[PDB]
Amino acid sequence: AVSFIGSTENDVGPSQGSYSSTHNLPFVYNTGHNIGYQNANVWRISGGFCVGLDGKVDLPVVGSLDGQSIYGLTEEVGLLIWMGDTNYSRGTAMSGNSWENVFSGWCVGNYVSTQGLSVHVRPVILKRNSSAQYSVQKTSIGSIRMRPYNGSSAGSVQTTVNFSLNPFTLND
Ligand SMILES: CC(=O)N[C@@H]1[C@@H](O)[C@H](O)[C@@H](CO)O[C@H]1O
């Protein structure tokens, strides 16, 4: 069986967070996973349910850096994005605007457990300005959906949750 136990709208990163550069364009801010969201318990699963995760970014793709997409927020600011299973360290680098397999999946046994997820992003400066500061308002990022497999089914259970980037300021 499966049921939804998480939240549908999720904020990524602390509200009105401020980040400073520590070091060429596009320039990527080394924010680790400070700008993220994670929840180990989004779906409750049991009885042999097999589930993985698909992730999708809705922001426009405005470039490619080191193998993954640069998603645009404004003409001067973009994002590198990772989506995946619960632990931030297992995030899958996102490219494109299609649903992508971000967690290969697992199968619970004949007991009850949960399926979680995580998302984190890193700011990218696409074009510099005279103020050496870049701010972005709250913006929808994309979604993550559970992907049942091996015959498992979502039935009438909610499959998708969404993510919105909390407003932030980048200081250089
Ligand atoms: C309470 C708990 O730990 N659930 C982790 C869950 O968050 C994760 O999505 C899944 C697959 O790695 O394995 C579960 O054991």
Side-chain angles (χ1 to χ4, degrees), residues 1-3 43 45-50 108-109 111-113 152-153 157:
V2 60
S3 61
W43 291 276
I45 60 175
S46 64
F49 201 84
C50 292
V108 63
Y111 56 97
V112 182
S113 190
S152 292
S153 176
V157 177

PDB file of all heavy atoms in Angstrom, residues 1-3 43-50 108-109 111-113 152-153 157, unseen atoms left out:
ATOM      1  N   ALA A   1       0.846  -1.225   0.000  1.00  0.00           N
ATOM      2  CA  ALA A   1       0.000   0.000   0.000  1.00  0.00           C
ATOM      3  C   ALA A   1       0.864   1.251   0.000  1.00  0.00           C
ATOM      4  O   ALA A   1       2.067   1.198   0.264  1.00  0.00           O
ATOM      5  CB  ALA A   1      -0.905   0.005   1.224  1.00  0.00           C
ATOM      6  N   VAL A   2       0.238   2.382  -0.296  1.00  0.00           N
ATOM      7  CA  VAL A   2       0.937   3.653  -0.310  1.00  0.00           C
ATOM      8  C   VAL A   2      -0.040   4.768   0.037  1.00  0.00           C
ATOM      9  O   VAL A   2      -1.232   4.684  -0.264  1.00  0.00           O
ATOM     10  CB  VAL A   2       1.575   3.939  -1.697  1.00  0.00           C
ATOM     11  CG1 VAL A   2       0.498   3.986  -2.774  1.00  0.00           C
ATOM     12  CG2 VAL A   2       2.349   5.248  -1.659  1.00  0.00           C
ATOM     13  N   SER A   3       0.464   5.796   0.707  1.00  0.00           N
ATOM     14  CA  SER A   3      -0.347   6.947   1.068  1.00  0.00           C
ATOM     15  C   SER A   3       0.567   8.163   1.130  1.00  0.00           C
ATOM     16  O   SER A   3       1.783   8.034   1.311  1.00  0.00           O
ATOM     17  CB  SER A   3      -1.050   6.727   2.414  1.00  0.00           C
ATOM     18  OG  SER A   3      -0.125   6.533   3.463  1.00  0.00           O
ATOM     19  N   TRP A  43       5.940   9.814   1.509  1.00  0.00           N
ATOM     20  CA  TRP A  43       4.944   8.778   1.234  1.00  0.00           C
ATOM     21  C   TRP A  43       5.180   7.630   2.196  1.00  0.00           C
ATOM     22  O   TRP A  43       6.323   7.301   2.513  1.00  0.00           O
ATOM     23  CB  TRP A  43       5.072   8.228  -0.186  1.00  0.00           C
ATOM     24  CG  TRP A  43       4.693   9.176  -1.258  1.00  0.00           C
ATOM     25  CD1 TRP A  43       3.437   9.433  -1.731  1.00  0.00           C
ATOM     26  CD2 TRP A  43       5.580  10.032  -1.975  1.00  0.00           C
ATOM     27  NE1 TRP A  43       3.491  10.400  -2.706  1.00  0.00           N
ATOM     28  CE2 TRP A  43       4.797  10.785  -2.877  1.00  0.00           C
ATOM     29  CE3 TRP A  43       6.967  10.237  -1.946  1.00  0.00           C
ATOM     30  CZ2 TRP A  43       5.356  11.731  -3.744  1.00  0.00           C
ATOM     31  CZ3 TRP A  43       7.523  11.175  -2.806  1.00  0.00           C
ATOM     32  CH2 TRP A  43       6.718  11.911  -3.692  1.00  0.00           C
ATOM     33  N   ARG A  44       4.095   7.037   2.674  1.00  0.00           N
ATOM     34  CA  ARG A  44       4.185   5.887   3.554  1.00  0.00           C
ATOM     35  C   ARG A  44       3.941   4.695   2.638  1.00  0.00           C
ATOM     36  O   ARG A  44       2.963   4.672   1.889  1.00  0.00           O
ATOM     37  CB  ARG A  44       3.111   5.944   4.641  1.00  0.00           C
ATOM     38  CG  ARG A  44       3.111   4.728   5.554  1.00  0.00           C
ATOM     39  CD  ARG A  44       2.058   4.840   6.642  1.00  0.00           C
ATOM     40  NE  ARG A  44       2.311   5.976   7.523  1.00  0.00           N
ATOM     41  N   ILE A  45       4.837   3.716   2.676  1.00  0.00           N
ATOM     42  CA  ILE A  45       4.698   2.545   1.822  1.00  0.00           C
ATOM     43  C   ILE A  45       4.784   1.255   2.621  1.00  0.00           C
ATOM     44  O   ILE A  45       5.374   1.224   3.700  1.00  0.00           O
ATOM     45  CB  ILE A  45       5.773   2.526   0.705  1.00  0.00           C
ATOM     46  CG1 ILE A  45       7.180   2.502   1.315  1.00  0.00           C
ATOM     47  CG2 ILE A  45       5.595   3.740  -0.201  1.00  0.00           C
ATOM     48  CD1 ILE A  45       8.285   2.369   0.285  1.00  0.00           C
ATOM     49  N   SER A  46       4.190   0.193   2.087  1.00  0.00           N
ATOM     50  CA  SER A  46       4.202  -1.094   2.762  1.00  0.00           C
ATOM     51  C   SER A  46       3.843  -2.230   1.814  1.00  0.00           C
ATOM     52  O   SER A  46       3.505  -2.012   0.650  1.00  0.00           O
ATOM     53  CB  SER A  46       3.200  -1.091   3.917  1.00  0.00           C
ATOM     54  OG  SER A  46       1.875  -0.938   3.427  1.00  0.00           O
ATOM     55  N   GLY A  47       3.928  -3.447   2.335  1.00  0.00           N
ATOM     56  CA  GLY A  47       3.572  -4.624   1.567  1.00  0.00           C
ATOM     57  C   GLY A  47       4.199  -4.822   0.204  1.00  0.00           C
ATOM     58  O   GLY A  47       3.484  -5.041  -0.772  1.00  0.00           O
ATOM     59  N   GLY A  48       5.523  -4.745   0.130  1.00  0.00           N
ATOM     60  CA  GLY A  48       6.215  -4.961  -1.129  1.00  0.00           C
ATOM     61  C   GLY A  48       6.155  -3.842  -2.151  1.00  0.00           C
ATOM     62  O   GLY A  48       6.528  -4.034  -3.309  1.00  0.00           O
ATOM     63  N   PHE A  49       5.703  -2.669  -1.734  1.00  0.00           N
ATOM     64  CA  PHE A  49       5.611  -1.539  -2.648  1.00  0.00           C
ATOM     65  C   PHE A  49       7.008  -1.153  -3.140  1.00  0.00           C
ATOM     66  O   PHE A  49       7.937  -1.018  -2.342  1.00  0.00           O
ATOM     67  CB  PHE A  49       4.991  -0.338  -1.937  1.00  0.00           C
ATOM     68  CG  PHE A  49       4.400   0.681  -2.871  1.00  0.00           C
ATOM     69  CD1 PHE A  49       3.103   0.526  -3.356  1.00  0.00           C
ATOM     70  CD2 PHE A  49       5.136   1.791  -3.275  1.00  0.00           C
ATOM     71  CE1 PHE A  49       2.551   1.463  -4.226  1.00  0.00           C
ATOM     72  CE2 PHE A  49       4.589   2.732  -4.146  1.00  0.00           C
ATOM     73  CZ  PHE A  49       3.296   2.566  -4.621  1.00  0.00           C
ATOM     74  N   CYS A  50       7.154  -0.978  -4.449  1.00  0.00           N
ATOM     75  CA  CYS A  50       8.429  -0.583  -5.043  1.00  0.00           C
ATOM     76  C   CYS A  50       8.260   0.831  -5.561  1.00  0.00           C
ATOM     77  O   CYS A  50       7.330   1.108  -6.321  1.00  0.00           O
ATOM     78  CB  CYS A  50       8.785  -1.503  -6.202  1.00  0.00           C
ATOM     79  SG  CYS A  50       9.172  -3.210  -5.715  1.00  0.00           S
ATOM     80  N   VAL A 108      10.003  -1.867  -0.417  1.00  0.00           N
ATOM     81  CA  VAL A 108       9.843  -2.148   1.000  1.00  0.00           C
ATOM     82  C   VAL A 108       9.388  -3.605   1.082  1.00  0.00           C
ATOM     83  O   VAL A 108       8.872  -4.153   0.107  1.00  0.00           O
ATOM     84  CB  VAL A 108       8.777  -1.219   1.640  1.00  0.00           C
ATOM     85  CG1 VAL A 108       7.414  -1.477   1.015  1.00  0.00           C
ATOM     86  CG2 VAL A 108       8.735  -1.423   3.150  1.00  0.00           C
ATOM     87  N   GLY A 109       9.603  -4.237   2.231  1.00  0.00           N
ATOM     88  CA  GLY A 109       9.191  -5.620   2.401  1.00  0.00           C
ATOM     89  C   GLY A 109       7.779  -5.693   2.952  1.00  0.00           C
ATOM     90  O   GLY A 109       6.959  -4.815   2.681  1.00  0.00           O
ATOM     91  N   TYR A 111       6.361  -4.863   5.609  1.00  0.00           N
ATOM     92  CA  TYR A 111       6.312  -4.002   6.779  1.00  0.00           C
ATOM     93  C   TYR A 111       6.075  -2.587   6.266  1.00  0.00           C
ATOM     94  O   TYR A 111       5.972  -2.368   5.056  1.00  0.00           O
ATOM     95  CB  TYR A 111       7.617  -4.061   7.589  1.00  0.00           C
ATOM     96  CG  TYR A 111       8.862  -3.720   6.806  1.00  0.00           C
ATOM     97  CD1 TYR A 111       9.407  -2.436   6.851  1.00  0.00           C
ATOM     98  CD2 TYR A 111       9.477  -4.669   5.989  1.00  0.00           C
ATOM     99  CE1 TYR A 111      10.529  -2.106   6.100  1.00  0.00           C
ATOM    100  CE2 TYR A 111      10.601  -4.348   5.236  1.00  0.00           C
ATOM    101  CZ  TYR A 111      11.121  -3.067   5.294  1.00  0.00           C
ATOM    102  OH  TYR A 111      12.218  -2.745   4.530  1.00  0.00           O
ATOM    103  N   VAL A 112       5.993  -1.634   7.184  1.00  0.00           N
ATOM    104  CA  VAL A 112       5.736  -0.245   6.831  1.00  0.00           C
ATOM    105  C   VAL A 112       6.979   0.632   6.892  1.00  0.00           C
ATOM    106  O   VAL A 112       7.769   0.545   7.828  1.00  0.00           O
ATOM    107  CB  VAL A 112       4.674   0.366   7.773  1.00  0.00           C
ATOM    108  CG1 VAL A 112       4.381   1.807   7.367  1.00  0.00           C
ATOM    109  CG2 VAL A 112       3.405  -0.473   7.747  1.00  0.00           C
ATOM    110  N   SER A 113       7.151   1.478   5.884  1.00  0.00           N
ATOM    111  CA  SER A 113       8.280   2.396   5.862  1.00  0.00           C
ATOM    112  C   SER A 113       7.870   3.654   5.109  1.00  0.00           C
ATOM    113  O   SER A 113       6.680   3.902   4.903  1.00  0.00           O
ATOM    114  CB  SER A 113       9.502   1.748   5.205  1.00  0.00           C
ATOM    115  OG  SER A 113      10.654   2.550   5.399  1.00  0.00           O
ATOM    116  N   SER A 152       3.687  -1.973  -8.873  1.00  0.00           N
ATOM    117  CA  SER A 152       3.089  -1.161  -7.822  1.00  0.00           C
ATOM    118  C   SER A 152       2.299  -0.049  -8.493  1.00  0.00           C
ATOM    119  O   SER A 152       2.560   0.310  -9.645  1.00  0.00           O
ATOM    120  CB  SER A 152       4.161  -0.571  -6.903  1.00  0.00           C
ATOM    121  OG  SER A 152       4.794  -1.587  -6.146  1.00  0.00           O
ATOM    122  N   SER A 153       1.335   0.501  -7.767  1.00  0.00           N
ATOM    123  CA  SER A 153       0.488   1.548  -8.311  1.00  0.00           C
ATOM    124  C   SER A 153       0.211   2.660  -7.317  1.00  0.00           C
ATOM    125  O   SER A 153       0.071   2.415  -6.120  1.00  0.00           O
ATOM    126  CB  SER A 153      -0.843   0.941  -8.761  1.00  0.00           C
ATOM    127  OG  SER A 153      -1.735   1.942  -9.222  1.00  0.00           O
ATOM    128  N   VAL A 157      -3.725   7.879  -4.921  1.00  0.00           N
ATOM    129  CA  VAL A 157      -2.855   8.635  -4.027  1.00  0.00           C
ATOM    130  C   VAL A 157      -2.061   9.730  -4.742  1.00  0.00           C
ATOM    131  O   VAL A 157      -1.619   9.551  -5.876  1.00  0.00           O
ATOM    132  CB  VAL A 157      -1.876   7.675  -3.309  1.00  0.00           C
ATOM    133  CG1 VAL A 157      -0.908   8.448  -2.430  1.00  0.00           C
ATOM    134  CG2 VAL A 157      -2.663   6.673  -2.480  1.00  0.00           C
TER     135      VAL A 157
END
